[PDB]
Design an enzyme around this catalytic site. Structure first.
Site, PDB file in Angstrom:
ATOM      1  N   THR A   9      33.426  45.351  31.884  1.00 10.53           N
ATOM      2  CA  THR A   9      32.086  45.561  31.361  1.00 10.53           C
ATOM      3  C   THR A   9      32.126  45.433  29.839  1.00 10.53           C
ATOM      4  O   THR A   9      33.174  45.635  29.221  1.00 10.53           O
ATOM      5  CB  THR A   9      31.567  46.963  31.711  1.00 10.53           C
ATOM      6  N   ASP A  39      35.256  45.858  27.391  1.00  6.79           N
ATOM      7  CA  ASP A  39      35.649  44.761  26.527  1.00  6.79           C
ATOM      8  C   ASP A  39      35.227  45.252  25.138  1.00  6.79           C
ATOM      9  O   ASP A  39      34.217  44.798  24.592  1.00  6.79           O
ATOM     10  CB  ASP A  39      34.872  43.501  26.894  1.00  6.79           C
ATOM     11  N   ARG A  71      35.140  34.864  31.747  1.00  4.39           N
ATOM     12  CA  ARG A  71      34.623  36.186  31.427  1.00  4.39           C
ATOM     13  C   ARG A  71      35.324  37.300  32.200  1.00  4.39           C
ATOM     14  O   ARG A  71      35.492  37.221  33.418  1.00  4.39           O
ATOM     15  CB  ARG A  71      33.113  36.200  31.686  1.00  4.39           C
ATOM     16  N   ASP A 109      32.497  42.596  39.441  1.00  4.41           N
ATOM     17  CA  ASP A 109      31.798  42.388  38.169  1.00  4.41           C
ATOM     18  C   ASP A 109      30.648  43.384  38.131  1.00  4.41           C
ATOM     19  O   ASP A 109      30.121  43.759  39.182  1.00  4.41           O
ATOM     20  CB  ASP A 109      31.262  40.958  38.090  1.00  4.41           C
ATOM     21  N   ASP A 111      27.556  43.072  37.441  1.00  3.68           N
ATOM     22  CA  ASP A 111      26.188  42.612  37.694  1.00  3.68           C
ATOM     23  C   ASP A 111      25.884  42.203  39.145  1.00  3.68           C
ATOM     24  O   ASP A 111      24.732  41.927  39.478  1.00  3.68           O
ATOM     25  CB  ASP A 111      25.793  41.456  36.740  1.00  3.68           C
ATOM     26  N   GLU A 196      39.692  32.368  40.305  1.00  6.22           N
ATOM     27  CA  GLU A 196      40.073  33.042  41.542  1.00  6.22           C
ATOM     28  C   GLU A 196      41.365  32.485  42.138  1.00  6.22           C
ATOM     29  O   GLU A 196      42.248  33.239  42.550  1.00  6.22           O
ATOM     30  CB  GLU A 196      38.944  32.946  42.584  1.00  6.22           C
ATOM     31  N   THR A 224      24.288  38.402  42.142  1.00  7.72           N
ATOM     32  CA  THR A 224      23.078  38.559  41.357  1.00  7.72           C
ATOM     33  C   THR A 224      23.399  38.582  39.860  1.00  7.72           C
ATOM     34  O   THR A 224      24.494  38.976  39.441  1.00  7.72           O
ATOM     35  CB  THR A 224      22.363  39.886  41.727  1.00  7.72           C
TER      36      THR A 224
END
Ligand SMILES: *O=P([O])([O])OP([O])(=O)O[C][C]1O[C](N2[C]=[C]C(=O)[N]C2=O)[C]([O])[C]1[O]
Ligand SMILES: *O=P([O])([O])OP([O])(=O)O[C][C]1O[C](N2[C]=[C]C(=O)[N]C2=O)[C]([O])[C]1[O]
Ligand SMILES: OC[C@H]1O[C@@H](O[C@@H]2[C@@H](O)[C@H](O)O[C@H](CO)[C@@H]2O)[C@H](O)[C@@H](O)[C@H]1O
Ligand SMILES: [Mn+2]
Ligand SMILES: [Mn+2]
Lengths: 250, 246
Positions: A9, A39, A71, A109, A111, A196, A224
Site C-alpha cells: 500500500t 511504500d 507496482r 493488492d 484495491d 506473476e 477492481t
C-alpha cells in the site's frame, strides 16, 4: 491453517478508504495474518492507526520503491524476506512463523475486491493453488481451464506467452514451499505482465497447479480499480486560504 | 435501534464486486436491515443469490428507471417503509408504525467504516457528518460551533449542501412526513435537498462524527473495466463462459 495476506500500500487520496473496506473484509476471516507493507520512508500515522484499530492479527512492514512500471514488487519481496526470518517489522507481530509451520501466502493488492469465500478456497493449498479472477486482463474473467480436476490450459487473451497467464490475485502459495525455495521472489525487471510468472516459475509447473473454486467455475475475487478523485475545487479553495482542514484525516 | 440501509443498484460489470464488499462491510453491523432495490425489469438471479447467501437481514425490491440516478429505487424503499409493500424477497413485512429506527441512503460504490453506523444510531431528526473525496474536495462537511451546524464546508453552490452519504433520518420523522421523498426531476446537486426540505431546517441538523471532525465514509467510485480482449475472444467464439457469474 493460517493465511498470510501480503498487501503493498502507498499514500494517495483513496488509500485510507481502500484499507478500511479491505481491513473490514479481512476481519470476517479466521486465522488470518495481515502483512501490510507501506511504500514509504517509515511507518505513517495513518497506516499505524488503522492497523491498531483494525482488531486484526497483523505485522506492519515498510520499504521504499526506488519503461515497465511494476507496482508493489519491492513491498511484496519485503514481506517474503520477513517470512524468511530476515526481520523488518515496525509494528504488530515482530517474529515470523518458524520453519515447519503450515500456512498459505496470498498477495492481495489493496484495491481488489475479495469475497470471504475466497479464503476458505486457498486455505488448503499444498503447493500452488489457482482460481479465476474477474474483470482482469481485459476479460470478464481470466482463469484456468480445468479437466478431470487438473489444469490443462488457460482462458486468457493478453500476453499469451506467459507461462502463468494469471493475475496476482489469482493464486496462493504454501508457506513451506516458499521457505524451501529461497530464490523465489518477484522480478522487478520482468516485462509488463510477467511479474506473476517470475515468482511462480521457481515454485511449480503450471500442470501442477491446484484448481480451486469448484474447479475454477466460480469467480471469488475481482480486479477492481478506484477512480482518482476530482480535486479542482480543493485546489481553488487552498489558493483562497480555505482548503479542507488538513488536521482531519481522509 | 435498527438502521435501515437503502441501497439502489443496477447491472453492470462491477455490480457483483461492489455488492460483495458492501454486504461484507454491513455484516459487521448489528441491528441493520438492508433494503436493496435493483434498477431493473425484474429481480436478477445475481442479486437474489447474493442477498440469500449474505446472511444479512434484508428486503429485496425492484423498479426500473428508463440526470440523477437511483432516485426511483430509493423512493420505492420509502414506499415500502410506509406500508405500501412492493417486496419480492426477504422480509416482506415493513416495520410496524411507531417503530423506532434510522434510515441511511448508501450508494453501492461508496466506502463506509463500521464506526459510521454507530454514530447515526442516535439520530433524533436528521443527523450529519463529513464525507470524503466528494464535491471536488478532500472532504465536504458541516461547520460546527458549540455543537451546532453553523455552516457548510462545500465548493459547489443549496439549503442542504451534503452528499447522499452524509446524513441519516429518524424513521418516525419519515413516517410523520408522508410527502417526504426524493424529487426525480431535481438536478444532481439538489437531490439531497429535495428530501430534507420536507423533514427539517438545516439549523436543526444533528452533527455527528465528533462534531464533524472525523471522516467515516468516502465517496469512492469504481473504474469501468476495459473489455477489448473480451470483444476479441467473442469474435473467435470463445468469450468468457456466460454461465460463470461475474
Ligand atoms: O494496476 P494494478 O491495479 O495491477 O496495480 P495497483 O495500482 O493496484 O498496484 C499494485 C499494488 O502495489 C501498491 N502500490 C502501487 C503503486 C506504488 O507506487 N506503490 C505501491 O505500493 C498498491 O497499493 C497495490 O496494492
Ligand atoms: O456519481 P455517483 O457516484 O453520485 O453516483 P453512482 O454512480 O454511484 O449512482 C448512484 C446510485 O444509484 C445506482 N444507479 C446508478 C445508475 C443507474 O442507472 N441506476 C442506479 O440504480 C448505483 O448503484 C448507486 O447506488
Ligand atoms: O493476467 C492479466 C495481467 O494483466 C496485466 O496488465 C495488462 C496491462 O498492462 C495492459 O495494458 O492491458 C492488458 C489487458 O489487455 C492487461 O490488463 C497485469 O500487469 C498483470 O498483473 C495481470 O493482471
Ligand atoms: Mn489494483
Ligand atoms: Mn457513487
Amino acid at each position: 491453517m493460517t493465511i498470510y495476506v501480503v498487501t503493498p500500500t502507498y499514500a494517495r487520496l483513496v488509500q485510507k478508504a481502500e484499507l478500511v473496506r479491505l481491513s473490514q473484509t479481512l476481519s470476517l476471516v479466521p486465522r488470518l495474518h495481515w502483512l501490510l507493507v507501506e511504500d514509504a520512508e517509515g511507518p505513517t500515522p495513518l497506516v499505524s492507526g488503522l492497523l491498531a484499530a483494525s482488531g486484526l492479527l497483523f505485522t506492519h512492514l515498510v520499504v521504499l520503491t526506488p519503461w515497465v512500471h511494476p507496482r508493489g514488487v519491492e513491498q511484496r519481496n519485503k514481506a517474503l524476506d520477513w517470512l524468511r526470518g530476515r526481520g523488518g517489522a515496525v509494528g504488530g507481530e515482530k517474529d515470523p512463523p518458524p520453519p515447519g509451520t503450515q500456512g498459505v501466502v496470498y498477495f492481495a493488492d489493496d484495491d481488489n475486491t475479495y469475497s470471504r469465500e475466497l479464503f476458505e478456497e486457498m486455505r488448503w493449498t499444498r503447493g500452488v493453488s489457482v482460481w479465476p479472477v474477474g474483470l482482469v486482463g481485459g476479460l470478464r474473467f481470466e482463469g484456468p481451464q480445468v479437466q478431470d480436476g487438473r489444469v490443462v490450459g488457460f482462458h486468457t487473451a493478453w500476453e499469451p506467452s506467459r507461462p502463468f497467464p494469471v493475475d496476482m490475485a489469482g493464486f496462493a502459495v504454501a508457506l513451506p514451499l516458499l521457505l524451501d525455495k529461497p530464490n523465489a521472489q518477484f522480478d522487478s525487471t520482468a516485462p509488463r505482465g510477467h511479474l506473476e510468472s517470475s515468482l511462480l516459475s521457481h515454485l511449480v509447473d503450471p500442470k501442477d497447479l491446484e484448481p480451486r473454486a469448484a474447479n475454477c467455475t466460480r469467480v471469488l475475487v475481482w480486479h477492481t480499480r478506484t477512480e482518482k478523485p476530482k480535486m479542482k475545487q480543493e485546489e481553488q479553495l487552498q489558493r483562497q486560504g480555505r482548503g479542507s482542514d488538513p488536521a482531519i484525516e481522509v
